[PDB]
PDB file of C-alpha atoms and ligand atoms in Angstrom:
ATOM      1  CA  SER W   1      13.868  18.643   0.239  1.00 35.81           C
ATOM      2  CA  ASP W   2      13.073  18.827  -3.563  1.00 34.72           C
ATOM      3  CA  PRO W   3      11.438  15.377  -4.357  1.00 32.86           C
ATOM      4  CA  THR W   4      13.159  15.424  -7.817  1.00 31.97           C
ATOM      5  CA  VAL W   5      16.748  15.713  -6.574  1.00 28.59           C
ATOM      6  CA  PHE W   6      18.617  12.391  -6.143  1.00 28.76           C
ATOM      7  CA  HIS W   7      22.213  12.631  -4.999  1.00 25.25           C
ATOM      8  CA  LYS W   8      24.504   9.851  -6.262  1.00 26.13           C
ATOM      9  CA  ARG W   9      25.885   9.470  -2.661  1.00 25.82           C
ATOM     10  CA  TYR W  10      22.540   8.063  -1.450  1.00 22.07           C
ATOM     11  CA  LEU W  11      21.951   5.805  -4.477  1.00 24.46           C
ATOM     12  CA  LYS W  12      22.940   2.148  -4.072  1.00 23.04           C
ATOM     13  CA  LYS W  13      22.832  -0.230  -7.077  1.00 22.79           C
ATOM     14  CA  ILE W  14      21.022  -3.533  -6.512  1.00 25.35           C
ATOM     15  CA  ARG W  15      20.879  -5.031 -10.077  1.00 23.06           C
ATOM     16  CA  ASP W  16      20.268  -4.288 -13.803  1.00 28.14           C
ATOM     17  CA  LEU W  17      16.598  -4.158 -15.055  1.00 24.41           C
ATOM     18  CA  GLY W  18      16.911  -3.617 -18.791  1.00 24.88           C
ATOM     19  CA  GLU W  19      19.229  -2.633 -21.636  1.00 23.74           C
ATOM     20  CA  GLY W  20      18.479  -1.021 -25.011  1.00 25.28           C
ATOM     21  CA  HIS W  21      20.771   0.202 -27.816  1.00 23.32           C
ATOM     22  CA  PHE W  22      21.381   3.584 -26.079  1.00 17.21           C
ATOM     23  CA  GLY W  23      20.341   3.230 -22.447  1.00 18.12           C
ATOM     24  CA  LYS W  24      20.638   1.031 -19.404  1.00 17.69           C
ATOM     25  CA  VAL W  25      17.996   0.788 -16.632  1.00 19.38           C
ATOM     26  CA  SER W  26      19.081  -0.434 -13.133  1.00 19.75           C
ATOM     27  CA  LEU W  27      17.432  -0.792  -9.703  1.00 20.68           C
ATOM     28  CA  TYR W  28      18.719   1.427  -6.892  1.00 19.72           C
ATOM     29  CA  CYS W  29      17.914   1.906  -3.224  1.00 19.87           C
ATOM     30  CA  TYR W  30      17.555   5.595  -2.300  1.00 23.28           C
ATOM     31  CA  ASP W  31      18.476   5.951   1.379  1.00 25.50           C
ATOM     32  CA  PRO W  32      19.536   9.554   2.304  1.00 28.82           C
ATOM     33  CA  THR W  33      19.025   8.897   6.094  1.00 32.46           C
ATOM     34  CA  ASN W  34      20.768   5.424   6.000  1.00 36.87           C
ATOM     35  CA  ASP W  35      17.510   3.987   7.666  1.00 39.70           C
ATOM     36  CA  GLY W  36      18.104   0.375   6.408  1.00 40.76           C
ATOM     37  CA  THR W  37      14.799   0.339   4.398  1.00 38.37           C
ATOM     38  CA  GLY W  38      14.953   3.260   1.891  1.00 36.11           C
ATOM     39  CA  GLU W  39      12.990   3.739  -1.342  1.00 33.83           C
ATOM     40  CA  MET W  40      13.401   1.556  -4.441  1.00 34.83           C
ATOM     41  CA  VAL W  41      13.814   3.473  -7.698  1.00 34.13           C
ATOM     42  CA  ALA W  42      14.646   2.642 -11.346  1.00 33.43           C
ATOM     43  CA  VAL W  43      17.515   4.717 -12.810  1.00 31.78           C
ATOM     44  CA  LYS W  44      18.019   4.973 -16.613  1.00 33.14           C
ATOM     45  CA  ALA W  45      21.350   6.183 -17.938  1.00 35.71           C
ATOM     46  CA  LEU W  46      22.712   6.805 -21.433  1.00 37.48           C
ATOM     47  CA  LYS W  47      25.455   4.315 -22.396  1.00 39.57           C
ATOM     48  CA  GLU W  48      29.001   5.575 -22.955  1.00 39.96           C
ATOM     49  CA  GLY W  49      29.462   6.011 -26.683  1.00 38.40           C
ATOM     50  CA  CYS W  50      26.344   8.070 -27.355  1.00 37.80           C
ATOM     51  CA  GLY W  51      27.380  11.144 -29.307  1.00 37.31           C
ATOM     52  CA  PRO W  52      25.980  14.712 -29.046  1.00 37.35           C
ATOM     53  CA  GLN W  53      22.884  13.896 -31.171  1.00 38.30           C
ATOM     54  CA  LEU W  54      21.871  11.043 -28.814  1.00 41.53           C
ATOM     55  CA  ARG W  55      22.808  13.209 -25.766  1.00 37.55           C
ATOM     56  CA  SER W  56      20.244  15.903 -26.979  1.00 39.07           C
ATOM     57  CA  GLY W  57      17.543  13.302 -27.590  1.00 38.32           C
ATOM     58  CA  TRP W  58      18.224  12.014 -24.028  1.00 37.96           C
ATOM     59  CA  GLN W  59      17.392  15.552 -22.663  1.00 33.64           C
ATOM     60  CA  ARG W  60      14.105  15.543 -24.695  1.00 31.95           C
ATOM     61  CA  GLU W  61      13.244  12.023 -23.409  1.00 31.68           C
ATOM     62  CA  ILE W  62      13.637  13.139 -19.748  1.00 28.32           C
ATOM     63  CA  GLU W  63      11.409  16.147 -20.608  1.00 28.07           C
ATOM     64  CA  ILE W  64       8.689  13.976 -22.300  1.00 29.19           C
ATOM     65  CA  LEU W  65       8.343  11.717 -19.170  1.00 26.21           C
ATOM     66  CA  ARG W  66       8.479  14.831 -16.847  1.00 26.98           C
ATOM     67  CA  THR W  67       5.343  15.980 -18.858  1.00 26.33           C
ATOM     68  CA  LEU W  68       3.351  12.649 -18.919  1.00 24.10           C
ATOM     69  CA  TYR W  69       0.801  11.933 -16.126  1.00 23.80           C
ATOM     70  CA  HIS W  70      -1.290   8.792 -16.546  1.00 25.97           C
ATOM     71  CA  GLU W  71      -2.057   5.730 -14.423  1.00 30.32           C
ATOM     72  CA  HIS W  72      -0.719   3.468 -17.232  1.00 28.76           C
ATOM     73  CA  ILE W  73       2.593   5.358 -17.731  1.00 29.73           C
ATOM     74  CA  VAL W  74       5.707   4.808 -15.463  1.00 25.87           C
ATOM     75  CA  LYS W  75       5.992   7.800 -13.058  1.00 26.06           C
ATOM     76  CA  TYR W  76       8.903  10.247 -13.394  1.00 26.23           C
ATOM     77  CA  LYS W  77      10.476  10.790  -9.964  1.00 27.87           C
ATOM     78  CA  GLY W  78      13.399  13.049 -10.800  1.00 24.50           C
ATOM     79  CA  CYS W  79      17.022  13.301 -11.950  1.00 25.78           C
ATOM     80  CA  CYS W  80      20.517  12.437 -10.728  1.00 21.19           C
ATOM     81  CA  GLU W  81      23.064  15.045 -11.975  1.00 21.66           C
ATOM     82  CA  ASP W  82      26.827  14.398 -12.112  1.00 21.79           C
ATOM     83  CA  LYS W  83      29.146  15.359 -15.800  1.00 19.33           C
ATOM     84  CA  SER W  84      26.003  13.447 -17.007  1.00 23.46           C
ATOM     85  CA  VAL W  85      22.225  13.102 -16.275  1.00 24.24           C
ATOM     86  CA  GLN W  86      20.407   9.983 -15.052  1.00 24.21           C
ATOM     87  CA  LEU W  87      16.583   9.590 -15.156  1.00 22.97           C
ATOM     88  CA  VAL W  88      14.904   8.421 -11.904  1.00 26.87           C
ATOM     89  CA  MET W  89      11.537   6.656 -12.272  1.00 28.78           C
ATOM     90  CA  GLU W  90       9.383   4.630  -9.876  1.00 27.38           C
ATOM     91  CA  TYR W  91      10.124   0.966  -9.167  1.00 28.75           C
ATOM     92  CA  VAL W  92       7.370  -1.408 -10.388  1.00 28.13           C
ATOM     93  CA  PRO W  93       7.691  -4.795  -8.605  1.00 28.23           C
ATOM     94  CA  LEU W  94       6.363  -7.186 -11.315  1.00 29.10           C
ATOM     95  CA  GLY W  95       8.671  -6.420 -14.295  1.00 32.90           C
ATOM     96  CA  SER W  96       8.006  -6.419 -18.053  1.00 34.94           C
ATOM     97  CA  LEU W  97       5.329  -8.502 -19.830  1.00 36.71           C
ATOM     98  CA  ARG W  98       8.222 -10.073 -21.765  1.00 36.31           C
ATOM     99  CA  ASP W  99       9.652 -11.393 -18.435  1.00 39.16           C
ATOM    100  CA  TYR W 100       6.331 -11.897 -16.574  1.00 38.20           C
ATOM    101  CA  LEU W 101       4.377 -13.853 -19.243  1.00 38.47           C
ATOM    102  CA  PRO W 102       6.570 -16.978 -19.865  1.00 39.58           C
ATOM    103  CA  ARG W 103       6.494 -17.886 -16.140  1.00 38.43           C
ATOM    104  CA  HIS W 104       2.987 -16.915 -15.028  1.00 39.12           C
ATOM    105  CA  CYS W 105      -0.440 -18.409 -15.601  1.00 37.20           C
ATOM    106  CA  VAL W 106      -2.420 -15.631 -17.283  1.00 36.49           C
ATOM    107  CA  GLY W 107      -5.885 -16.293 -18.638  1.00 36.01           C
ATOM    108  CA  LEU W 108      -7.226 -14.684 -21.847  1.00 31.70           C
ATOM    109  CA  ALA W 109      -9.423 -12.153 -19.912  1.00 30.83           C
ATOM    110  CA  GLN W 110      -6.349 -10.897 -17.889  1.00 30.38           C
ATOM    111  CA  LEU W 111      -4.319 -10.767 -21.184  1.00 31.41           C
ATOM    112  CA  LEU W 112      -7.168  -8.640 -22.744  1.00 31.87           C
ATOM    113  CA  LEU W 113      -7.280  -6.449 -19.632  1.00 32.48           C
ATOM    114  CA  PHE W 114      -3.460  -5.896 -20.032  1.00 32.60           C
ATOM    115  CA  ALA W 115      -4.016  -4.932 -23.718  1.00 30.21           C
ATOM    116  CA  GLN W 116      -6.779  -2.484 -22.636  1.00 30.03           C
ATOM    117  CA  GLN W 117      -4.532  -0.638 -20.113  1.00 29.57           C
ATOM    118  CA  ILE W 118      -1.845  -0.383 -22.872  1.00 33.17           C
ATOM    119  CA  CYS W 119      -4.468   1.347 -25.137  1.00 29.52           C
ATOM    120  CA  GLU W 120      -5.543   3.684 -22.318  1.00 31.43           C
ATOM    121  CA  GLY W 121      -1.955   4.842 -21.742  1.00 33.43           C
ATOM    122  CA  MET W 122      -1.435   4.930 -25.509  1.00 35.48           C
ATOM    123  CA  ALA W 123      -4.630   7.048 -26.101  1.00 34.55           C
ATOM    124  CA  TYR W 124      -3.402   9.532 -23.455  1.00 34.29           C
ATOM    125  CA  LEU W 125       0.111   9.543 -25.129  1.00 34.96           C
ATOM    126  CA  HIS W 126      -1.542  10.351 -28.550  1.00 34.19           C
ATOM    127  CA  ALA W 127      -3.777  13.066 -26.940  1.00 34.69           C
ATOM    128  CA  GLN W 128      -0.620  14.760 -25.529  1.00 38.52           C
ATOM    129  CA  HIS W 129       0.630  14.709 -29.174  1.00 36.88           C
ATOM    130  CA  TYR W 130       3.370  12.115 -28.847  1.00 37.00           C
ATOM    131  CA  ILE W 131       4.268   8.968 -30.787  1.00 33.73           C
ATOM    132  CA  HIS W 132       5.986   6.089 -28.902  1.00 35.35           C
ATOM    133  CA  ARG W 133       7.947   4.154 -31.632  1.00 39.86           C
ATOM    134  CA  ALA W 134       8.823   1.208 -29.301  1.00 39.45           C
ATOM    135  CA  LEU W 135       5.430  -0.323 -28.189  1.00 39.11           C
ATOM    136  CA  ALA W 136       6.587  -3.898 -27.521  1.00 41.17           C
ATOM    137  CA  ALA W 137       5.794  -6.286 -24.567  1.00 45.64           C
ATOM    138  CA  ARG W 138       9.314  -5.700 -23.211  1.00 44.76           C
ATOM    139  CA  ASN W 139       8.489  -1.967 -22.649  1.00 43.25           C
ATOM    140  CA  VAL W 140       5.139  -2.673 -20.905  1.00 40.05           C
ATOM    141  CA  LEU W 141       5.541  -3.114 -17.101  1.00 42.26           C
ATOM    142  CA  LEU W 142       3.401  -4.584 -14.249  1.00 43.52           C
ATOM    143  CA  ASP W 143       3.069  -2.727 -10.951  1.00 38.05           C
ATOM    144  CA  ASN W 144       1.335  -3.782  -7.723  1.00 42.94           C
ATOM    145  CA  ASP W 145      -1.938  -5.623  -8.452  1.00 46.91           C
ATOM    146  CA  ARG W 146      -0.821  -6.337 -12.085  1.00 45.73           C
ATOM    147  CA  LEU W 147      -1.495  -2.663 -13.071  1.00 44.46           C
ATOM    148  CA  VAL W 148       0.046  -1.926 -16.508  1.00 47.13           C
ATOM    149  CA  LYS W 149       2.601   0.881 -16.935  1.00 44.59           C
ATOM    150  CA  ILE W 150       4.245   1.764 -20.322  1.00 47.28           C
ATOM    151  CA  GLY W 151       7.834   1.953 -19.087  1.00 41.37           C
ATOM    152  CA  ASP W 152      10.121   3.230 -21.812  1.00 40.66           C
ATOM    153  CA  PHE W 153      10.038   6.449 -23.926  1.00 42.98           C
ATOM    154  CA  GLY W 154      13.542   6.337 -25.509  1.00 38.48           C
ATOM    155  CA  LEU W 155      12.173   6.633 -29.087  1.00 40.69           C
ATOM    156  CA  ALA W 156       9.116   8.764 -28.239  1.00 40.22           C
ATOM    157  CA  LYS W 157       8.790  11.968 -30.331  1.00 37.59           C
ATOM    158  CA  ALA W 158       6.632  15.113 -30.228  1.00 38.08           C
ATOM    159  CA  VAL W 159       4.395  15.243 -33.351  1.00 41.53           C
ATOM    160  CA  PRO W 160       4.674  18.843 -34.816  1.00 40.38           C
ATOM    161  CA  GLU W 161       1.624  21.104 -34.039  1.00 43.16           C
ATOM    162  CA  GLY W 162      -0.985  20.147 -36.687  1.00 42.04           C
ATOM    163  CA  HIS W 163       0.472  16.932 -38.112  1.00 44.99           C
ATOM    164  CA  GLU W 164      -0.570  13.288 -38.208  1.00 44.92           C
ATOM    165  CA  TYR W 165       3.059  12.044 -38.467  1.00 45.98           C
ATOM    166  CA  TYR W 166       6.718  12.655 -37.559  1.00 47.99           C
ATOM    167  CA  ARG W 167       9.445  12.194 -40.224  1.00 47.72           C
ATOM    168  CA  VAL W 168      12.029   9.804 -38.758  1.00 46.44           C
ATOM    169  CA  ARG W 169      14.826   8.293 -40.861  1.00 45.45           C
ATOM    170  CA  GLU W 170      17.110   5.180 -41.291  1.00 48.61           C
ATOM    171  CA  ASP W 171      17.542   2.342 -38.682  1.00 47.61           C
ATOM    172  CA  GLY W 172      17.466  -1.441 -39.012  1.00 51.42           C
ATOM    173  CA  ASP W 173      18.499  -1.229 -35.326  1.00 53.29           C
ATOM    174  CA  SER W 174      15.070   0.173 -34.132  1.00 50.18           C
ATOM    175  CA  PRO W 175      12.064  -2.221 -33.335  1.00 48.32           C
ATOM    176  CA  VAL W 176      11.473  -2.881 -37.066  1.00 50.30           C
ATOM    177  CA  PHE W 177       9.522  -6.158 -36.477  1.00 49.71           C
ATOM    178  CA  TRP W 178       6.802  -4.030 -34.665  1.00 50.04           C
ATOM    179  CA  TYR W 179       6.657  -1.511 -37.583  1.00 47.16           C
ATOM    180  CA  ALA W 180       3.935  -0.637 -40.083  1.00 48.03           C
ATOM    181  CA  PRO W 181       4.969  -0.519 -43.824  1.00 46.67           C
ATOM    182  CA  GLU W 182       4.436   3.311 -44.076  1.00 46.88           C
ATOM    183  CA  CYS W 183       7.148   4.141 -41.543  1.00 47.43           C
ATOM    184  CA  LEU W 184       9.410   1.418 -42.986  1.00 44.67           C
ATOM    185  CA  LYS W 185       8.880   2.559 -46.643  1.00 40.49           C
ATOM    186  CA  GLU W 186       8.200   6.369 -46.363  1.00 42.53           C
ATOM    187  CA  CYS W 187      10.048   7.132 -43.063  1.00 43.17           C
ATOM    188  CA  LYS W 188       6.731   8.635 -41.808  1.00 41.53           C
ATOM    189  CA  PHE W 189       5.656   7.489 -38.341  1.00 43.25           C
ATOM    190  CA  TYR W 190       1.900   8.199 -37.885  1.00 43.17           C
ATOM    191  CA  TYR W 191      -0.268   7.885 -34.763  1.00 44.62           C
ATOM    192  CA  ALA W 192      -1.698   4.821 -36.673  1.00 47.47           C
ATOM    193  CA  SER W 193       1.895   3.419 -36.866  1.00 46.52           C
ATOM    194  CA  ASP W 194       1.821   2.920 -33.033  1.00 46.79           C
ATOM    195  CA  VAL W 195      -1.549   1.081 -33.457  1.00 47.56           C
ATOM    196  CA  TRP W 196       0.283  -1.405 -35.750  1.00 48.27           C
ATOM    197  CA  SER W 197       2.883  -1.896 -32.930  1.00 48.26           C
ATOM    198  CA  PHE W 198      -0.030  -2.519 -30.469  1.00 47.24           C
ATOM    199  CA  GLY W 199      -1.211  -5.361 -32.778  1.00 46.56           C
ATOM    200  CA  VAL W 200       2.269  -6.985 -32.531  1.00 45.93           C
ATOM    201  CA  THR W 201       2.336  -6.440 -28.712  1.00 44.83           C
ATOM    202  CA  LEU W 202      -1.153  -8.159 -28.555  1.00 45.49           C
ATOM    203  CA  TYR W 203       0.343 -11.004 -30.624  1.00 46.08           C
ATOM    204  CA  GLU W 204       3.209 -11.207 -28.044  1.00 44.69           C
ATOM    205  CA  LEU W 205       0.552 -11.350 -25.234  1.00 41.75           C
ATOM    206  CA  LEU W 206      -1.207 -14.226 -26.978  1.00 42.56           C
ATOM    207  CA  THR W 207       2.041 -16.138 -27.499  1.00 43.53           C
ATOM    208  CA  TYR W 208       2.961 -15.406 -23.798  1.00 43.50           C
ATOM    209  CA  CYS W 209       6.235 -13.897 -25.235  1.00 42.75           C
ATOM    210  CA  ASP W 210       7.290 -17.398 -26.418  1.00 42.21           C
ATOM    211  CA  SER W 211      10.696 -16.761 -28.093  1.00 39.19           C
ATOM    212  CA  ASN W 212       9.861 -19.608 -30.541  1.00 43.89           C
ATOM    213  CA  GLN W 213       6.748 -17.700 -31.735  1.00 42.01           C
ATOM    214  CA  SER W 214       8.435 -14.218 -31.368  1.00 44.40           C
ATOM    215  CA  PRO W 215       8.225 -11.612 -34.227  1.00 45.42           C
ATOM    216  CA  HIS W 216      12.065 -11.923 -34.579  1.00 47.39           C
ATOM    217  CA  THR W 217      11.999 -15.774 -35.122  1.00 50.41           C
ATOM    218  CA  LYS W 218       8.798 -15.571 -37.329  1.00 49.04           C
ATOM    219  CA  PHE W 219      10.084 -12.741 -39.588  1.00 48.49           C
ATOM    220  CA  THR W 220      13.703 -14.175 -39.606  1.00 47.55           C
ATOM    221  CA  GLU W 221      12.056 -17.460 -40.819  1.00 50.33           C
ATOM    222  CA  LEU W 222      10.645 -15.531 -43.827  1.00 50.23           C
ATOM    223  CA  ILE W 223      13.405 -12.844 -44.566  1.00 46.90           C
ATOM    224  CA  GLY W 224      16.385 -14.913 -43.338  1.00 48.82           C
ATOM    225  CA  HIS W 225      19.536 -13.364 -41.916  1.00 50.73           C
ATOM    226  CA  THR W 226      19.589  -9.577 -42.632  1.00 50.64           C
ATOM    227  CA  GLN W 227      20.955  -6.352 -41.013  1.00 54.59           C
ATOM    228  CA  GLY W 228      20.244  -2.588 -41.197  1.00 56.76           C
ATOM    229  CA  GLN W 229      18.359  -1.259 -44.232  1.00 54.64           C
ATOM    230  CA  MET W 230      18.348  -4.758 -45.802  1.00 56.63           C
ATOM    231  CA  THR W 231      15.953  -5.903 -42.943  1.00 57.37           C
ATOM    232  CA  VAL W 232      13.793  -2.699 -43.462  1.00 61.00           C
ATOM    233  CA  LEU W 233      13.545  -3.471 -47.278  1.00 59.58           C
ATOM    234  CA  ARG W 234      12.819  -7.226 -47.054  1.00 60.09           C
ATOM    235  CA  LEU W 235      10.153  -6.585 -44.363  1.00 65.85           C
ATOM    236  CA  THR W 236       8.456  -3.796 -46.489  1.00 67.44           C
ATOM    237  CA  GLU W 237       8.436  -6.335 -49.373  1.00 68.99           C
ATOM    238  CA  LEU W 238       6.557  -8.872 -47.127  1.00 69.52           C
ATOM    239  CA  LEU W 239       4.100  -6.418 -45.478  1.00 69.86           C
ATOM    240  CA  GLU W 240       2.585  -4.411 -48.397  1.00 71.12           C
ATOM    241  CA  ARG W 241       2.405  -7.790 -50.228  1.00 73.17           C
ATOM    242  CA  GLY W 242      -0.115  -8.755 -47.435  1.00 73.14           C
ATOM    243  CA  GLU W 243       1.916 -11.081 -45.179  1.00 72.65           C
ATOM    244  CA  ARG W 244       1.113 -10.841 -41.382  1.00 69.18           C
ATOM    245  CA  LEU W 245       2.173 -12.692 -38.155  1.00 69.60           C
ATOM    246  CA  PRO W 246       0.222 -16.018 -37.771  1.00 67.38           C
ATOM    247  CA  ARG W 247      -2.761 -16.732 -35.482  1.00 67.90           C
ATOM    248  CA  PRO W 248      -1.038 -17.708 -32.156  1.00 64.88           C
ATOM    249  CA  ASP W 249      -1.682 -21.151 -30.557  1.00 64.49           C
ATOM    250  CA  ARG W 250      -4.982 -21.029 -28.522  1.00 67.65           C
ATOM    251  CA  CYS W 251      -5.904 -17.549 -29.864  1.00 66.15           C
ATOM    252  CA  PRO W 252      -9.710 -17.039 -30.548  1.00 66.28           C
ATOM    253  CA  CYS W 253     -10.296 -15.896 -34.189  1.00 66.16           C
ATOM    254  CA  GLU W 254     -12.056 -12.599 -33.125  1.00 62.21           C
ATOM    255  CA  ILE W 255      -8.878 -11.552 -31.182  1.00 58.96           C
ATOM    256  CA  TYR W 256      -6.659 -12.334 -34.207  1.00 58.22           C
ATOM    257  CA  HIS W 257      -9.078 -10.206 -36.329  1.00 57.89           C
ATOM    258  CA  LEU W 258      -8.443  -7.382 -33.788  1.00 57.94           C
ATOM    259  CA  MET W 259      -4.708  -7.871 -34.439  1.00 59.38           C
ATOM    260  CA  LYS W 260      -5.406  -7.883 -38.270  1.00 57.90           C
ATOM    261  CA  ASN W 261      -7.438  -4.665 -37.956  1.00 57.60           C
ATOM    262  CA  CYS W 262      -4.427  -2.964 -36.249  1.00 57.50           C
ATOM    263  CA  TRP W 263      -2.407  -4.338 -39.207  1.00 57.38           C
ATOM    264  CA  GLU W 264      -4.431  -2.745 -42.102  1.00 55.71           C
ATOM    265  CA  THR W 265      -1.945  -1.735 -44.915  1.00 56.41           C
ATOM    266  CA  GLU W 266      -3.761   1.629 -45.163  1.00 58.16           C
ATOM    267  CA  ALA W 267      -2.839   3.462 -41.884  1.00 56.41           C
ATOM    268  CA  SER W 268      -6.129   5.519 -41.927  1.00 57.00           C
ATOM    269  CA  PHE W 269      -8.155   2.209 -41.877  1.00 58.59           C
ATOM    270  CA  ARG W 270      -6.709   1.050 -38.452  1.00 55.81           C
ATOM    271  CA  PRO W 271      -8.674   1.630 -35.193  1.00 56.24           C
ATOM    272  CA  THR W 272      -7.530   4.408 -32.854  1.00 57.91           C
ATOM    273  CA  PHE W 273      -6.348   3.729 -29.279  1.00 56.03           C
ATOM    274  CA  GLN W 274      -9.486   5.698 -28.243  1.00 56.10           C
ATOM    275  CA  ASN W 275     -11.570   3.094 -30.268  1.00 55.78           C
ATOM    276  CA  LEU W 276      -9.562   0.105 -28.968  1.00 58.57           C
ATOM    277  CA  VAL W 277     -10.320   0.777 -25.252  1.00 58.55           C
ATOM    278  CA  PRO W 278     -14.129  -0.167 -25.349  1.00 55.03           C
ATOM    279  CA  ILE W 279     -13.488  -3.013 -27.875  1.00 57.09           C
ATOM    280  CA  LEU W 280     -11.094  -4.701 -25.415  1.00 54.05           C
ATOM    281  CA  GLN W 281     -13.410  -3.946 -22.407  1.00 54.37           C
ATOM    282  CA  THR W 282     -16.169  -5.956 -24.201  1.00 51.59           C
ATOM    283  CA  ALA W 283     -13.648  -8.661 -25.291  1.00 51.86           C
ATOM    284  CA  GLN W 284     -12.473  -8.777 -21.625  1.00 50.51           C
ATOM    285  CA  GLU W 285     -16.158  -9.150 -20.493  1.00 50.61           C
ATOM    286  CA  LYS W 286     -16.930 -11.869 -23.095  1.00 49.13           C
ATOM    287  CA  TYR W 287     -14.309 -14.272 -21.536  1.00 50.97           C
ATOM    288  CA  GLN W 288     -15.199 -14.699 -17.777  1.00 50.47           C
TER     289      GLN W 288
HETATM  290  O1  0MX E   1      11.923  -3.998 -14.365  1.00 52.74           O
HETATM  291  C1  0MX E   1      11.572  -3.964 -13.210  1.00 52.74           C
HETATM  292  N1  0MX E   1      11.204  -2.816 -12.599  1.00 52.74           N
HETATM  293  C2  0MX E   1      11.097  -1.525 -13.091  1.00 52.74           C
HETATM  294  N2  0MX E   1      10.729  -0.573 -12.229  1.00 52.74           N
HETATM  295  N3  0MX E   1      10.729   0.640 -12.928  1.00 52.74           N
HETATM  296  C3  0MX E   1      11.093   0.419 -14.203  1.00 52.74           C
HETATM  297  C4  0MX E   1      11.234   1.296 -15.293  1.00 52.74           C
HETATM  298  C5  0MX E   1      11.647   0.789 -16.534  1.00 52.74           C
HETATM  299  C6  0MX E   1      11.964  -0.578 -16.692  1.00 52.74           C
HETATM  300  C7  0MX E   1      12.299  -1.177 -18.030  1.00 52.74           C
HETATM  301  C8  0MX E   1      11.807  -0.541 -19.186  1.00 52.74           C
HETATM  302  C9  0MX E   1      12.015  -1.064 -20.463  1.00 52.74           C
HETATM  303  C10 0MX E   1      12.702  -2.271 -20.610  1.00 52.74           C
HETATM  304  N4  0MX E   1      12.888  -2.778 -21.865  1.00 52.74           N
HETATM  305  S1  0MX E   1      14.328  -2.974 -22.565  1.00 52.74           S
HETATM  306  O2  0MX E   1      15.192  -3.723 -21.674  1.00 52.74           O
HETATM  307  O3  0MX E   1      14.230  -3.683 -23.812  1.00 52.74           O
HETATM  308  C11 0MX E   1      14.900  -1.482 -22.822  1.00 52.74           C
HETATM  309  C12 0MX E   1      14.566  -0.792 -23.997  1.00 52.74           C
HETATM  310  C13 0MX E   1      15.022   0.516 -24.202  1.00 52.74           C
HETATM  311  C14 0MX E   1      15.815   1.143 -23.246  1.00 52.74           C
HETATM  312  C15 0MX E   1      16.176   0.469 -22.076  1.00 52.74           C
HETATM  313 CL1  0MX E   1      17.016   1.176 -21.021  1.00 52.74          CL
HETATM  314  C16 0MX E   1      15.688  -0.828 -21.855  1.00 52.74           C
HETATM  315  C17 0MX E   1      13.174  -2.934 -19.454  1.00 52.74           C
HETATM  316  C18 0MX E   1      12.968  -2.405 -18.176  1.00 52.74           C
HETATM  317  C19 0MX E   1      11.761  -1.447 -15.601  1.00 52.74           C
HETATM  318  C20 0MX E   1      11.348  -0.953 -14.353  1.00 52.74           C
HETATM  319  C21 0MX E   1      11.454  -5.332 -12.592  1.00 52.74           C
HETATM  320  C22 0MX E   1      11.841  -6.573 -13.090  1.00 52.74           C
HETATM  321  C23 0MX E   1      11.404  -7.520 -12.190  1.00 52.74           C
HETATM  322  C24 0MX E   1      10.716  -6.872 -11.181  1.00 52.74           C
HETATM  323  O4  0MX E   1      10.758  -5.438 -11.536  1.00 52.74           O
END
């Protein structure tokens, strides 16, 4: 049989795994032969209420993941056709860094190794000419042997042929607290804009995804209670002014400087994912 065809009749829902604004990801057992064991798979589906523009983007998302092959990117397994389409990916037993970090003992060197694998997947993603737009700890997953896998591509976009950015409009609903000022102000999401999001993800790693130190709580503390384009505006006001997330508790200064370098106001002055890989390898070596 075609390894990419999953018939609904052999899919059995275990539990939910994650929920975004547009999609839902659940764990299923695939057992065509009713053998008791079966194969565990993650199935992502578009929520009811997504209009034709979201439905088209959903087709492009499935196609982007079909295309990506990297050790630090969640593997595409196939599709489940109804009348709607569900995206079948591999099951990664350790979950997201947002759910793994608050309850596990993770030393600085292992945190830096996690950050490195993110960069490796991210450098491959940028080489294939794609931007991610949602690089947050919650979208980074751990497989067997704590092997990192970027797990969600819902906002990923193809960067046109010879361009350094994709023009993407209005949304105070998107991960705005992980966003560089240039895509908040100019609606231009550069390759360097994803590097800014890495800096925030590294901050999340160093705060062990502590909800009290979270970008939401820290930026809500400054901006207050805001929604939509009001959040986008108030944040832009803070960022190009020079305001950045604080140095997390127990974070060595040189790591915070790495965060700050990913947070340069001028997009062209931020390191590339290609440059970040050896920097983190050395940082990883420095501590144990
Ligand atoms: O989670 C597991 N196992 C997985 N195996 N395979 C997977 C593929 C993707 C996800 C996944 C990806 C992203 C998010 N973030 S989000 O909730 O904010 C979100 C954002 C945007 C869209 C959607 Cl839909 C969800 C959550 C889960 C998880 C697994 C797991 C947990 C414990 C052990 O194992």
